[PDB]
Amino acid sequence: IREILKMGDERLLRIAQPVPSELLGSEELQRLIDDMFETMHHVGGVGLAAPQIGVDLQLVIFGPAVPPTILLNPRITPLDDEMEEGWEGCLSVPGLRGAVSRHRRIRYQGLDPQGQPIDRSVEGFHARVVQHECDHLIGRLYPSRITDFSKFGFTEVL
Template identity: 35%
Template sequence: MKTIADIVLLGDPRLYEQCAPVLEQELPLVAGWVADLHTVMEDIRTTYHFGRGIAAPQIGVMKRLVYLHLDGQPRVLLNPELIELSEASFELWDDCMSFPNLLVRVQRHQQVTIRYRDEHWQPHSWTVRDGISELLQHECDHLDGILCTMRAIDTQSFRWRPTPAPT
């Protein structure tokens, strides 16, 4: 079982690699990968007090897999693909589990539609706005080896997150 100690940190070359698709014959492996992603995300939430989604390369699994846990509901996205991006955009301070104390000011599409398969290999399409739109763009970027540091609005778009009090 992976833990927060297994998170792939900024500077690790794996974060800059494009991930391979999950193949249907790899479905038996997905449950284990998802369990690891869930455990690591919960560790991040406990330690840093943020985390709604995590991409497989952040734990060293170089597959096109994103795990979300929103409002108590888990969602597994295999081979996600952003298929529609709104022209409207917004700016925000983005964070990342691979560099949890750094915030990066980025611009993201206000609305996106994503196509993916679930853990049962069923196809889905999902249209989201605002915060979830930003989250999906961030996680899909990870699958393509793109970090939010590479999407910074300018050279002044970085700041440290205050260190959370120990719990």
Template identity: 35%
Template sequence: MTERQIRIFGDPVLKTVSDPIGSIDDRVRGLVDDLVDSVRPPGRAGVAASQIGVNLRAFSYNIDGDIGYILNPVIVETRGDKEPVEEGCLSVPGLWYPTPRYPFVRVTGTDVDGNTIELSGTGLLAQALQHEVDHLDGLLYLDRLEKADRRAAMKEIRESDWF
């Protein structure tokens, strides 16, 4: 289908809790195609439907060349204590801050045929799964930052040329 434009900080869709996907129709299939096309460019680990302006619970991922998607994802398991991991976001261009994330995560959901999908891992995959589910819950990684880092990030945003 099409690589879609990424919505930027300040767009209300990024702070909206996404609706669950009910029946799978051509609209949902088209969304999946767009999500997959939108995550292909280099440097993209994940794209949530809300980041392309669609208020549905779906995201795509691109981890070490493994590209896929998941509908109605739910984090079903975390392991370890949260650790600060350098994190950025396509919707907050140019900013990177240490964000507390679990070192292991397992997510379940479905594909467009209704089959169960399970994604689990550590490192970048664990970080991306948490980051994208946060998007679907109306959260940006900025919402997870320590107070001083969040204040610094907001200052950087206000001074950026894209805001």
């Protein structure tokens, strides 16, 4: 159970480095992956990005069902311009929720932990989780994507 970094920490604002091919299939990576699974489970997240536990790598884990997925070096492509508002919380932003507008429909690509391509087109909540998780790899937390501040508040008030 590694510590979740909280908003204010410089390490959540870094652009993350790509997982070098050398780590693919490795004991080092598998250990990092299990560390993130324990931590994500101990605090009840549906997602977690390696920079939230201070690990500077393009690696997210996630999974209204979404499959358990370990996604490395991702790239997102919107499939159209349709956008959609939904509630987001973040473990690095305890006590708060915002409404955020994201692409309704995305393709995502990257590598599984063995080096095998991932390639998926998804919609709705599955597309939201992935966009949320990949924003952490470019140093972005949801309050920086809010355009309607009437919907930003403390979870106990909203």
